[PDB]
Design a protein around this nucleic acid. Structure first.
Ligand SMILES: [Mg+2]
Ligand SMILES: [Mg+2]
Ligand SMILES: [Mg+2]
Ligand SMILES: [Mg+2]
Ligand SMILES: [Mg+2]
Ligand SMILES: [Mg+2]
Ligand SMILES: [Mg+2]
Ligand SMILES: [Mg+2]
Ligand SMILES: [Mg+2]
Ligand SMILES: [Mg+2]
Ligand SMILES: [Mg+2]
Ligand SMILES: [Mg+2]
Ligand SMILES: [Mg+2]
Ligand SMILES: [Mg+2]
Ligand SMILES: [Mg+2]
Lengths: 88, 101, 119, 73
RNA sequence: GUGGGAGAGGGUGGUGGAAUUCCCGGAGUAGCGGUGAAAUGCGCAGAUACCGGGAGGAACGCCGAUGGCGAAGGCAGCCACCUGGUCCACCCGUGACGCUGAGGCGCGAAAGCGUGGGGAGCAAACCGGAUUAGAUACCCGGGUAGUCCACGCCCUAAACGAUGCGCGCUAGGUCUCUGGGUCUCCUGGGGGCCGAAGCUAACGCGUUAAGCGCGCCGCCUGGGGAGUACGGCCGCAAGGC
RNA sequence: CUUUCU
């Protein structure tokens, strides 16, 4: 699954400042993580719909955060995207 | 790396030589799949609740290994292969939930 | 022609007819009997009485093969199960034991409408 | 009417999770490989839930039965 | 975010015992079966009842609840793997990032459809027996599609709480499932019953509102004609909207 | 057992 390490290693990798857990970026970071994992889980299990909804929801919450970002500081935004790999 | 428990049951008629033969393989098998053996509990022969493979008895084993989740099945998919091996049940380590204590 | 003494008796009861079957310690039948066996066709077949008759019949016949001790095994229900046993117990044979070994699935084959309904 | 005694009482500090402890588990089965109710075992929906799970394991392992023949009748 | 919890939530691989059917060996004989009665049917090519072995399909007794999980449809043997939702504690981080939601997209019991496979039991149609005044039925004996798997359709339902979603507020009592606590009681989430105020035509609802309010969506406008005709869109078709 | 109608 997703190691605490795997997780935290990402949190550190994004925090606005030391000890940043809930900043917008961090969140978007994590989601892209959980999304990508599950994005994979279904690459195989094309039947497992129930899980797929969970996915739809994640994609939601993400676009929503970002939209907010885009709006507030259009800079950080352009940053986070590139920095991640969203918008193919 | 997760801790499991490998219940194993083979033919109770085996002779010390034939019996060791199987064990030899089991140990190997485990090690063939990163089954780091934390401990053993070889109970021996026991009166089965119902016959198995026709035999009214069963010779048990119990290894509390630690190995790669991604290969637990492979491991047993491999253990069941042996013929004198009639039962295999790779449980997962669980904190002892007590009661009336 | 065999002389067994220590045997075994199987009572298969049903809401349609009772039918006992005496057997040797290995499980091989020796003598058998049904409500059918003794007259009684169709309806009368089941009834506890017919069951008594058959019960006895079974023993009486196995009384030749020299039977004496028997372990009774009941299967099913039906007017006549418990009854038959009463018979055997008397008859002449020593009824060392009784055990209900009626078959029951742990839910497998869909029963016919007759016995459906369960949700 | 299950008015005898809770199996749990006539027992000790035992691990409901141990599926090889025949000697103690065998207690929760009736006069058949039938896992007793709570009106007889007397455990929390949670404890009882675990036992049941455990027992079934013993069955596969072959230490505990699935169903015994009913004597008497 | 961190630390915990429960669960038939979903997907994959495997695996356990019970029962039914069939096949094999044994033993054994005159019936079995089925009904209100019966018959059809099966049985001396030896059935039924019994023991042993095998093969196979489908379902998962007890636990089991008056229970749990899911958005719904729905989900219960056991094991591992992959994976969704969700609750609690700590107040630790962001700083209104919120709600609803016409279209869109997805999911959607059963039956049904396409291709391939599988088929033990069950069973529309059908073939017989019986019942009846008649029996195109109810009962009995058979039985094909189907039921099962994969892949692709179909898109319905008493798809029921016949009760759209979210939020704030308005006595309690009692039972219960799951978390936390100073753990004979407190407190958070969930399932029930009784009931304040209030509401309702009544029945009833009543902190799990059908009460008091605000936000957004859907919907109704007497019965029949009619969920029909027509047009359109979707479907392989049945047919749906 | 099925067991209509006014
Ligand atoms: Mg704070
Ligand atoms: Mg600040
Ligand atoms: Mg459907
Ligand atoms: Mg279907
Ligand atoms: Mg088809
Ligand atoms: Mg007919
Ligand atoms: Mg029929
Ligand atoms: Mg049939
Ligand atoms: Mg209450
Ligand atoms: Mg409550
Ligand atoms: Mg009032
Ligand atoms: Mg009320
Ligand atoms: Mg009109
Ligand atoms: Mg067309
Ligand atoms: Mg008339």
């Amino acid at each position: 699954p997703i190691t605490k390490e795997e997780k935290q290693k990402v949190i550190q990798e994004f925090a606005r400042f030391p000890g940043d857990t809930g900043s917008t970026e961090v969140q978007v970071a994590l989601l892209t993580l959980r999304i990508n994992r599950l994005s994979e889980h279904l690459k195989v299990h094309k039947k497992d719909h129930h899980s797929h909804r969970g996915l739809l929801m994640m994609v939601g919450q993400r676009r929503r955060l970002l939209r907010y970002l885009q709006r507030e500081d259009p800079e950080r935004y352009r940053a986070l995207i590139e920095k991640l790999g969203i918008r193919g | 790396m997760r801790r499991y428990e490998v219940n194993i049951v083979l033919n109770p008629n085996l002779d010390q030589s034939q019996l060791a033969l199987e064990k030899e393989i089991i140990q190997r098998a485990l090690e063939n799949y990163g089954a780091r053996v934390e401990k053993v509990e070889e109970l021996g022969l026991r009166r089965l609740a119902y016959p198995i493979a026709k035999d009214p008895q069963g010779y048990f084993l119990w290894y509390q290994v630690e190995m790669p989740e991604d290969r637990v099945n492979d491991l047993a998919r491999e253990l069941r292969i042996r013929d004198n091996v009639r039962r295999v049940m790779v449980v997962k380590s669980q904190e002892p939930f007590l009661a009336n204590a | 022609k065999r002389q067994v003494a220590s045997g075994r008796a199987y009572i298969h009861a049903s809401y349609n007819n009772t039918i006992v079957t005496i057997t040797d310690p290995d499980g091989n039948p020796i003598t058998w009997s049904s409500g059918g066996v003794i007259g009684y066709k169709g309806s009368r077949k089941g009834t506890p009485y017919a069951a008594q008759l058959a019960a006895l019949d079974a023993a009486k016949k196995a009384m030749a093969y020299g039977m004496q001790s028997v372990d009774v095994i009941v299967r099913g229900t039906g007017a006549g199960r418990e009854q038959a046993i009463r018979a055997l117990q008397a008859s002449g044979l020593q009824v060392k034991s009784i055990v209900d070994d009626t078959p029951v699935p742990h839910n497998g084959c869909r029963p016919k409408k007759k016995f459906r309904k369960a949700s | 009417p299950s008015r005898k005694a809770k199996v749990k009482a006539t027992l000790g500090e035992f691990d409901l999770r141990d599926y090889r402890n025949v000697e103690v588990l065998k207690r929760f089965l009736s006069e058949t490989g039938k896992i007793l109710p709570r009106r007889r075992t007397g455990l929390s929906g949670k404890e009882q839930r675990i036992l049941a799970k455990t027992i079934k394991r013993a069955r596969i392992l072959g230490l505990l039965p699935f169903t015994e023949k009913l004597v008497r009748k």
